[PDB]
Amino acid sequence: SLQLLNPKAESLRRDAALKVNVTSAEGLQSVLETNLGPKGTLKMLVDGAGNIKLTKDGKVLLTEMQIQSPTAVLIARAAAAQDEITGDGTTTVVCLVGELLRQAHRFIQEGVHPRIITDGFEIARKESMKFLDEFKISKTNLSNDREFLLQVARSSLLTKVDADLTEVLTPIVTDAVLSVYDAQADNLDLHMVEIMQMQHLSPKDTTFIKGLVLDHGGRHPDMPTRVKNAYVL
Amino acid sequence: ISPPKPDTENNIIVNDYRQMDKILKEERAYLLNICKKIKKAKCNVLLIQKSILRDAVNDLALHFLSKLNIMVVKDIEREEIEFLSKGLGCKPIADIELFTEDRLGSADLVEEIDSDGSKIVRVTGIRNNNARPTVSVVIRGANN
Amino acid sequence: MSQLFNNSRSDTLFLGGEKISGDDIRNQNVLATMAVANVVKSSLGPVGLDKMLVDDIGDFTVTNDGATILSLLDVQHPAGKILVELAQQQDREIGDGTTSVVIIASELLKRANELVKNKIHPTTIITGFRVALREAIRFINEVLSTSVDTLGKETLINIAKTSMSSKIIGADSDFFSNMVVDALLAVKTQNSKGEIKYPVKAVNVLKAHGKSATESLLVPGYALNCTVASQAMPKRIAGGNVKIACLDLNLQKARMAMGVQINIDDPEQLEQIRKREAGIVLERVKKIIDAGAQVVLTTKGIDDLCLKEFVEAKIMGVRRCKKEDLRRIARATGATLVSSMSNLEGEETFESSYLGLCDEVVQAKFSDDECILIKGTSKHSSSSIILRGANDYSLDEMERSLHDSLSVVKRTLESGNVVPGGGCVEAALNIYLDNFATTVGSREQLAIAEFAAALLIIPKTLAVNAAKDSSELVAKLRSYHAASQMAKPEDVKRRSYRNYGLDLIRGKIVDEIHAGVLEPTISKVKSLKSALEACVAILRIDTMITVDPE
Amino acid sequence: MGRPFIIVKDQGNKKRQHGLEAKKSHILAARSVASIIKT
Amino acid sequence: MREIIHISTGQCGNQIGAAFWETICGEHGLDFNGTYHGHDDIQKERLNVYFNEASSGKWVPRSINVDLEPGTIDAVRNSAIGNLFRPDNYIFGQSSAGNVWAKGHYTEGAELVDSVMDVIRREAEGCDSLQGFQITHSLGGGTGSGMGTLLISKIREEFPDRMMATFSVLPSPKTSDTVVEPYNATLSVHQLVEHSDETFCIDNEALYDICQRTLKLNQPSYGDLNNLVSSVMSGVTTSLRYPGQLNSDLRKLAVNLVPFPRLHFFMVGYAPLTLTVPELTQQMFDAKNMMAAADPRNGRYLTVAAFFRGKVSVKEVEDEMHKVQSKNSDYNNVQTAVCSVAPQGLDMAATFIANSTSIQELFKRVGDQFSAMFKRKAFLHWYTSEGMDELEFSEAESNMNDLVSEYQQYQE
Amino acid sequence: SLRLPQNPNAGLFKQGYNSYSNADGQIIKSIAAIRELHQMCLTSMGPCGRN
Amino acid sequence: VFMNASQERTTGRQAQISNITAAKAVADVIRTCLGPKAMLKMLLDPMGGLVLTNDGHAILREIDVAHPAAKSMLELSRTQDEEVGDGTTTVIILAGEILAQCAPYLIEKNIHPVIIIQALKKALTDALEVIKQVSKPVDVENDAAMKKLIQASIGTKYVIHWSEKMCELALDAVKTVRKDFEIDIKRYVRVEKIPGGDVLDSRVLKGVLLNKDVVHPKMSRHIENPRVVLLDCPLEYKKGESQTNIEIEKEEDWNRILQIEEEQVQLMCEQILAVRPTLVITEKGVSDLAQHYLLKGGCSVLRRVKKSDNNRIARVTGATIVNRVEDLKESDVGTNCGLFKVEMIGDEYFSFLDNCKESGLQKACTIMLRGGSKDILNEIDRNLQDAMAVARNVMLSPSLSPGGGATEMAVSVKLAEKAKQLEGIQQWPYQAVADAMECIPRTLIQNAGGDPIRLLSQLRAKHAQGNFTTGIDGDKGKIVDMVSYGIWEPEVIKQQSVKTAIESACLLLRVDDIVSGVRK
Ligand SMILES: Nc1nc2c(ncn2[C@@H]2O[C@H](COP(=O)(O)OP(=O)(O)OP(=O)(O)O)[C@@H](O)[C@H]2O)c(=O)[nH]1
Ligand SMILES: Nc1ncnc2c1ncn2[C@@H]1O[C@H](COP(=O)(O)OP(=O)(O)O)[C@@H](O)[C@H]1O
Numbered sequence A: 001s002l003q004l005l006n007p008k009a010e011s012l013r014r015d016a017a018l019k020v021n022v023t024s025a026e027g028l029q030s031v032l033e034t035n036l037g038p039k040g041t042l043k044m045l046v047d048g049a050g051n052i053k054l055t056k057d058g059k060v061l062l063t064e065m066q067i068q069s070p071t072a073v074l075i076a077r078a079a080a081a082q083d084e085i086t087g088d089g090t091t092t093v094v095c096l097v098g099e100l101l102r103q104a105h106r107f108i109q110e111g112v113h114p115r116i117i118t119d120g121f122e123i124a125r126k127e128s129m130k131f132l133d134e135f136k137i138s139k140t141n142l143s144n145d146r147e148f149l150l151q152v153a154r155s156s157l158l159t160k161v162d163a164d165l166t167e168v169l170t171p172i173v174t175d176a177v178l179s180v181y182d183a184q185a186d187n188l189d190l191h192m193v194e195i196m197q198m199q200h201l202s203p204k205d206t207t208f209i210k211g212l213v214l215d216h217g218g219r220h221p222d223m224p225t226r227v228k229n230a231y232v233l
Numbered sequence B: 001i002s003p004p005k006p007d008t009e010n011n012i013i014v015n016d017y018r019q020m021d022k023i024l025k026e027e028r029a030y031l032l033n034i035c036k037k038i039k040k041a042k043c044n045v046l047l048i049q050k051s052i053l054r055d056a057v058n059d060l061a062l063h064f065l066s067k068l069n070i071m072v073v074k075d076i077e078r079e080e081i082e083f084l085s086k087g088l089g090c091k092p093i094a095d096i097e098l099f100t101e102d103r104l105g106s107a108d109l110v111e112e113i114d115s116d117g118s119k120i121v122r123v124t125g126i127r128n129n130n131a132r133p134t135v136s137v138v139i140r141g142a143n144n
Numbered sequence C: 001m002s003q004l005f006n007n008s009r010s011d012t013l014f015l016g017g018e019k020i021s022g023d024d025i026r027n028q029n030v031l032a033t034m035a036v037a038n039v040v041k042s043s044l045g046p047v048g049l050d051k052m053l054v055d056d057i058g059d060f061t062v063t064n065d066g067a068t069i070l071s072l073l074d075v076q077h078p079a080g081k082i083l084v085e086l087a088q089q090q091d092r093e094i095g096d097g098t099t100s101v102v103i104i105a106s107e108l109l110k111r112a113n114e115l116v117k118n119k120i121h122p123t124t125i126i127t128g129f130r131v132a133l134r135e136a137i138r139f140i141n142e143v144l145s146t147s148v149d150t151l152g153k154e155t156l157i158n159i160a161k162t163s164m165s166s167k168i169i170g171a172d173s174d175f176f177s178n179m180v181v182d183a184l185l186a187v188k189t190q191n192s193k194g195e196i197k198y199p200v201k202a203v204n205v206l207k208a209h210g211k212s213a214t215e216s217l218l219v220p221g222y223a224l225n226c227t228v229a230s231q232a233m234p235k236r237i238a239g240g241n242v243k244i245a246c247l248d249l250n251l252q253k254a255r256m257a258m259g260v261q262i263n264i265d266d267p268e269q270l271e272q273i274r275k276r277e278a279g280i281v282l283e284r285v286k287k288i289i290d291a292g293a294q295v296v297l298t299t300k301g302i303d304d305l306c307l308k309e310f311v312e313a314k315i316m317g318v319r320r321c322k323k324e325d326l327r328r329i330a331r332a333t334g335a336t337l338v339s340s341m342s343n344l345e346g347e348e349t350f351e352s353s354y355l356g357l358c359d360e361v362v363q364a365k366f367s368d369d370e371c372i373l374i375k376g377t378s379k380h381s382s383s384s385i386i387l388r389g390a391n392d393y394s395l396d397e398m399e400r401s402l403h404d405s406l407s408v409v410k411r412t413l414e415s416g417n418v419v420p421g422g423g424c425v426e427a428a429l430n431i432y433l434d435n436f437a438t439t440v441g442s443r444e445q446l447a448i449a450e451f452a453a454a455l456l457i458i459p460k461t462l463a464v465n466a467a468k469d470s471s472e473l474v475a476k477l478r479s480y481h482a483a484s485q486m487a488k489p490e491d492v493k494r495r496s497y498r499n500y501g502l503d504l505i506r507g508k509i510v511d512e513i514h515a516g517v518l519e520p521t522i523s524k525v526k527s528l529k530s531a532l533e534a535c536v537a538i539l540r541i542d543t544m545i546t547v548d549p550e
Numbered sequence D: 001m002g003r004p005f006i007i008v009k010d011q012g013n014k015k016r017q018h019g020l021e022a023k024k025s026h027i028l029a030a031r032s033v034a035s036i037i038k039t
Numbered sequence E: 001m002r003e004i005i006h007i008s009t010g011q012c013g014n015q016i017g018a019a020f021w022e023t024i025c026g027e028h029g030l031d032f033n034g035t036y037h038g039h040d041d042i043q044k045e046r047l048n049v050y051f052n053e054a055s056s057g058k059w060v061p062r063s064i065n066v067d068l069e070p071g072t073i074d075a076v077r078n079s080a081i082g083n084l085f086r087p088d089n090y091i092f093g094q095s096s097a098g099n100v101w102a103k104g105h106y107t108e109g110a111e112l113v114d115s116v117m118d119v120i121r122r123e124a125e126g127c128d129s130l131q132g133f134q135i136t137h138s139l140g141g142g143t144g145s146g147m148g149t150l151l152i153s154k155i156r157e158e159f160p161d162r163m164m165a166t167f168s169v170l171p172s173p174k175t176s177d178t179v180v181e182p183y184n185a186t187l188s189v190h191q192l193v194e195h196s197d198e199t200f201c202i203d204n205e206a207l208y209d210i211c212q213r214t215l216k217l218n219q220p221s222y223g224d225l226n227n228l229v230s231s232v233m234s235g236v237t238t239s240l241r242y243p244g245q246l247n248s249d250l251r252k253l254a255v256n257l258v259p260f261p262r263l264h265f266f267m268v269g270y271a272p273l274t275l276t277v278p279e280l281t282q283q284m285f286d287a288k289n290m291m292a293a294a295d296p297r298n299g300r301y302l303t304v305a306a307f308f309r310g311k312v313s314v315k316e317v318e319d320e321m322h323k324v325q326s327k328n329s330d331y332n333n334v335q336t337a338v339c340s341v342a343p344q345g346l347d348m349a350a351t352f353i354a355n356s357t358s359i360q361e362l363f364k365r366v367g368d369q370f371s372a373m374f375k376r377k378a379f380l381h382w383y384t385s386e387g388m389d390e391l392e393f394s395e396a397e398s399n400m401n402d403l404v405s406e407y408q409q410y411q412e
Numbered sequence F: 001s002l003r004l005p006q007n008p009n010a011g012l013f014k015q016g017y018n019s020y021s022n023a024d025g026q027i028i029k030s031i032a033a034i035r036e037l038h039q040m041c042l043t044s045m046g047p048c049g050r051n
Numbered sequence G: 001v002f003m004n005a006s007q008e009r010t011t012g013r014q015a016q017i018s019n020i021t022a023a024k025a026v027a028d029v030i031r032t033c034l035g036p037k038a039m040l041k042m043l044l045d046p047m048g049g050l051v052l053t054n055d056g057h058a059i060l061r062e063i064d065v066a067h068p069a070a071k072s073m074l075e076l077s078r079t080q081d082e083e084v085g086d087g088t089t090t091v092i093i094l095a096g097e098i099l100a101q102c103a104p105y106l107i108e109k110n111i112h113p114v115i116i117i118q119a120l121k122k123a124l125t126d127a128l129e130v131i132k133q134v135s136k137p138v139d140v141e142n143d144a145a146m147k148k149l150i151q152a153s154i155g156t157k158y159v160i161h162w163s164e165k166m167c168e169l170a171l172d173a174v175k176t177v178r179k180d181f182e183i184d185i186k187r188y189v190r191v192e193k194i195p196g197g198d199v200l201d202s203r204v205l206k207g208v209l210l211n212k213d214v215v216h217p218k219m220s221r222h223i224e225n226p227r228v229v230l231l232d233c234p235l236e237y238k239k240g241e242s243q244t245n246i247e248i249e250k251e252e253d254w255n256r257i258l259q260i261e262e263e264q265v266q267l268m269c270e271q272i273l274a275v276r277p278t279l280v281i282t283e284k285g286v287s288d289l290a291q292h293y294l295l296k297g298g299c300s301v302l303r304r305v306k307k308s309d310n311n312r313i314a315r316v317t318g319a320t321i322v323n324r325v326e327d328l329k330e331s332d333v334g335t336n337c338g339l340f341k342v343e344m345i346g347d348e349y350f351s352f353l354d355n356c357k358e359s360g361l362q363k364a365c366t367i368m369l370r371g372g373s374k375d376i377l378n379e380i381d382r383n384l385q386d387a388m389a390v391a392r393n394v395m396l397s398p399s400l401s402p403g404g405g406a407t408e409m410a411v412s413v414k415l416a417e418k419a420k421q422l423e424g425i426q427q428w429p430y431q432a433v434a435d436a437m438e439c440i441p442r443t444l445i446q447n448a449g450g451d452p453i454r455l456l457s458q459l460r461a462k463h464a465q466g467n468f469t470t471g472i473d474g475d476k477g478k479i480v481d482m483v484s485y486g487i488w489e490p491e492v493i494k495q496q497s498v499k500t501a502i503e504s505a506c507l508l509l510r511v512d513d514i515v516s517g518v519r520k
């Protein structure tokens, strides 16, 4: 139907479109399968010249390596969009879509319709939302437990970096987050917490500064370097 | 017939604001008083040649010429000016100071007639003191 | 038909292309004519079918008119360019018979080339056509019929069906024939000292693909395709006697004339100059707002600085548009198009006499489009046509089809005399000219006889487009017509035959008066003359000379 | 009818002549041969 | 003032900027390592306009090259001219604008622009005399057009006065295959006019004609085009980096060449496209040397400004002007700027930049494509999806009605 | 989203092999295509047939 | 040679054969994209994006066919989308069949392409009659039936599981845009997207949603009763229109020139503070200095807001588009603003404007979408356009036609019965109209997996005897009446499907020859 209309085109239908979505899903799953977990493997990305950038985040792997397949670009936007607002759960989205397609494809080969299969996922999803209410546990913020925040910080930091970097960088986050809670209880992440690059002695020498650090100083030599009580303007 | 812009470069300077207002007023008057003097000679049809370095008839001037019932025709070739003066017996007018009634021609019905997409301005009847009259013959056909 | 190309000659050295002579030129000219005549031969009449032409960018054009299909066919041959420009001359003048005049010229060059091969000179052939055409126009005057004893607008309705046919909207001719006749009676104007000339490009066409061609709404008034300036303005002005102000003025922020270079020594004058700039624009609007212009029309655009007062005063704004549409709005509403607002006295002002008058104005939505519909004009009536179809290419076909239909009824009202259609004119001129020149005898009898046969190609072309037995109809046509011309003056029935002929739908001989097939007399007048001059231009060519480009 | 129009093979190399001008080259071609051996 | 930053955005932007720096560095003298092997004061005493003296004299240009396609930036960087630019300057982020004003622009302004405002700030804090910014964008592409529009706006906010010069490359109707080129080029000018202060129009279609006519290269490569664009840029910048007073410094250029605010667009003119001042006179004003598709003879010059180079006196140029004004009167306008240094390779050139009503042709064209070929609301869903509405397009066509009008208003 | 994955059964039968199965539309492709040659034998049928 | 043509002129009968085969090929691409069990379609555009959908209109936008007859079929989806907004695949799939059924005759029984057109207009005239008779009216104010009417089109999409929320989402949005005849337009319907979140918490909120934050940090992030005032102009000193050139002679002039730059922005700010607004929304950019004293009164300054987003604010807050600041009064100031609040999302900031809710101008609103990814947002946004399109037809036309192919099958039965009494030459094309109208239920049975042989035979046996509301259940694949099934669609979509499909056939049937490559 498409060849007499368009003189040049490509068309897959009714068996290859299903194999493509599953094969591309299993292919992209195998890339990020090894990175998931604390003992996962690191992954560098050197593009043109040899710029080097090292991380285990699936978003950096997806939003730096160009991809041609039509299925994976939707997994890239899905893995990116979930992480861009939440900041966690990138590879988990790829593993679910990476596994749920192959786990349903065996039954498509058996001859079950795709419509009623996806109807089962939706009604099963509503059961998980009802299960989140019973599965979660209430925690009162008035106690101001600093040990509870330390354990939450080590969950993500142990996954990315080793224990040497986690122990020294964990209280840097806890001291920054301890000041977030106030009487208004309005959370502010982008304006309050920032990151700045500085090539210095080593990664282990990261320290916490309660005030605002600036990347510039006094141009003239005679201007004072250190000031005890400085009233800003 | 155009806004004043003479041969030597003319740089207009506006020092106060009343002056912006005035410059406009004075112009809506430099075109008006010249058109007012055309009514004094009761000249009913004007024929302008091809204008160089500026527009022949300003769009602001057409409002004064259109309300007073004056036909305006521009973009006439320069060599044809000898033809019109010789045929109609009308001497050309290069300045309003020399614009008088005796130098103008006459006609019974100056009319643009249109034939299926061809616009024609034909003058019916010529009477003048001229020993060298003119003649004009149109051509019609299928293609050029 | 030409083979074995002419040899490059060493004795005759001309720069550019080689010279070629003999009968091959008139064979090549006729062969070039058949290349274009076969294209337009199929799309003739109601049974005729048209073709498509792509523009090499995905776009295409499904065209029924002979002028449009030849305009896109850029003919490199010189002889074909004569017929291409003739159709561009035909549709602009009369707007009818564009396909027939090319088909008549092609059949003339066919038989004229055959007569040159029969060893008679083209000068005698041209003299045979001119004396024959002078008798043909004399015969066209004999077969005229004045409209009389007709109930209402029936003569204007059924004559439009002949022009409405051979299109996609011929099935809906019962619905479009009323509004087309009513449209031209709405734009009646007296011009040039008593000459009632109905005009077009006065009636409008708006491309709104949507519901169907059957439900095309005739809005009794003027329509304009323009977007609203500000969306906060009201889309419906209530109350009668709505005043319309037509302008050509620019309401955009003023800038003083070029040759002006401001130079000031005092710093404090910058407030004031700036103010004066905006102020001139506002004064210019402040006088027309106080005049009560409910809906202002303009050609040059309006910037947001002046749209505040229109939103505050509930005035509708109008953006860029064509220069010609505002002239007819002023004529219908009674306004006057002002190129530049001024006064004969030494002070600017705005008079109330420049305002128009209409009953109602509203912005109707044609399914994606903003169009200001004006209805109930006071000074002169107006009309607009809302075209609807399946897709934009059909709307383009509806544009030129209505332009042909409007043009036919336009020339119908210029001259009350009419002539029947359906090949009866060509069938009668054939037998009339065959009887002619029998007394002349010697040489011009063969030239005029083939001329009489050249006009029969139209009833032959209409028959084969129907995919029916053509010679069965040609036997009925010519014979019936002959039996009418020969007859006594005193024979009612036979005389009537002179009136009827070919039918393309049912395939039998029926009366054109009851069927409603009718054409104007002006459509045939000056059509054979254009085909005659088209035949003369190619027939007199002996040799062809081509100069290569530098 | 199509753009190809062939009746005999190799129409590009084969070229006809006709009319009075075609015969004119033949007699004038004999003058060149005659004028060489005329002396 | 003393210095001007030079932003380069887009694949066309990066290419033209790399060519421009390749020209500039060799002009007043620096090996691609930054070291200065030049002779002497003349080439060094205005080097601070575009280079930051670092301790140790490793001059480094002040340029911010940006693109949403890692690849173009990468290629340029891995190539030669890869030691000069500081590694931190490049700002490049996946995926690709996708050749869409709407999408590329909004999406990555949302990200790349933040990073760019960050780089434009601190690196520049480093100077004591910002004068303005020079942007090289392509009017018709994706990243360059969209981002350019966003950045121009963002910068203008963070630097009110600072002049803003652009060298946008207008699209080629014939050689720009992509169909949605006009529909972007229109949305870009919508905002270029409201913000910019002086802009130069370069048309690839015009560049092809000059490449094949004068140079006679059989097939133009983007390289050739880039070299010619580079030469005009170099002349205009020398108008700046060589001690001089004739049009000394950017702001002056603007004042001299801009009669009224809403007319930024200039027609570059450069010769000796492959010598005596009288010889170069004809080459500058030849209708074929314009790098703009529109014919300037049919149009009208408003303010002319010719930038000569090499050995030329005051009077060579003045006498030439007197002779020329006399014959092209129907077409008193003049502005001369003699320089002392000479073109790399050639002894003397003469760049030509005149405002001309003829640009309105190059805009009547683009408006015709934009409207007529998108009355059918073609390829619009790509833009409505990103989030921007169609009212914005109506505003865009409306503002070109305006531009055209202006040029028509200054009686062509 | 530029280049397809190229049908990963391409490791199977070579590019010269073309499959035109059903469901895809083989019957519709065939019955129709042969209507051209069906008109050839139809026009050449009968005593008034065309050679 | 001769003019640029005559490459290969497809003339005679083979030209029309290619058009019927080409027109049939367009419907075969989206044959499976109909019914409740319809499959999705991922199309790859050459720029780099992706379009995931099953709507025939959105599919045919991205496709490109190098054939002129198929492009006329391509444009029919724009006829349906920009007229109602629902049933675009129904238009493409019906016409294919009409051109196909008429083909046998064109190819073999030699009926000329004009006699078929005359037969179709009488079939078109009879089609509107039976569609008018088969449709039953329905009350417009019944919210219980309106929710079931809106979700008829949602059932053929992915969000049928969230149909309980989408009908409430679409019903509240349509009544907001509805003006008290009953004309509404989707240009104010804001399609702003938010990637991520759950569909359950997604809700419509009265007012607008900006992508920007306040400029200065001291601006109030929570106002009880905002008073919005729209500005068009730059709030900053601008160069100005004419050739200016100040010439400075004394030393006390340049500091005066820079001082009046400060006083002019004071003059325009002080007159804005005559009414004392809380939020000043400027169209163009803002200066760092004027904002400073806008602060010395209690206003709030934002970045440049495009025009579109201000015309919605004008109808929400009731303010007017204002450019001249000297003519600012107290009457044109926006009021009755509910609440102001700014949430933190990692993508960008978002400023919320709520309305007090308590005739006048029609109110606008912004519908919040909280999908899974970017493609899920664009998928759900087109569902709202297809769902909200249904709500317009019931207000413009209170008639309601039965769904599930019962309307088109009713056209098939009456045209088949009346074809016997229509004896003549028009009988063969008139009877072939019923053959295509019975295919739009046949496609539902094929997608459901049932046998359409016995179902259609059982359908025609019960359609004449049982009732006029009989149809096929797409999920179960059995004959179930539409009254008990409780799913209904408007009658306006049935009119555009029959009109556009037949009118498309009348155009394409008149095609004689195809000549490609003439000129640009
Ligand atoms: N004058 C000139 N124009 C160029 C050159 N290279 C590319 N272009 C122009 O670049 C335009 C398209 O490139 P861009 O729009 O910059 O591409 P892009 O959008 O940055 O690329 P992505 O961000 O990956 O989509 C075309 O109109 C070309 O005319 C060059 O060397 N010279
Ligand atoms: N309904 C009809 N009955 C008989 N003859 C008709 C009918 N309609 C058109 N014709 C004939 O077809 C010829 C061409 O008509 P048309 O195609 O409308 O004009 P054109 O030749 O300008 O395209 C006319 O000369 C007319 O006699």
Ligand SMILES: Nc1ncnc2c1ncn2[C@@H]1O[C@H](COP(=O)(O)OP(=O)(O)O)[C@@H](O)[C@H]1O
Residues within 6 Å of the ligand: G034, G035, G036, G055, G056, G086, G087, G088, G089, G090, G152, G153, G154, G155, G156, G403, G404, G405, G406, G444, G472, G473, G474, G475, G487
């Ligand atoms: N639940 C259903 N059961 C049977 N038929 C249905 C059902 N829903 C829709 N249809 C049929 O599908 C056709 C198209 O409906 P819909 O999918 O909403 O429009 P579109 O074709 O534009 O996607 C309708 O004519 C209707 O008869």
Ligand SMILES: [Mg+2]
Residues within 6 Å of the ligand: A088, A089, A156, A159
């Ligand atoms: Mg994590």
Ligand SMILES: [Mg+2]
Residues within 6 Å of the ligand: C096, C097, C098, C163, C166, C404
């Ligand atoms: Mg006609």
Ligand SMILES: [Mg+2]
Residues within 6 Å of the ligand: G086, G087, G153, G156, G386
């Ligand atoms: Mg639907």
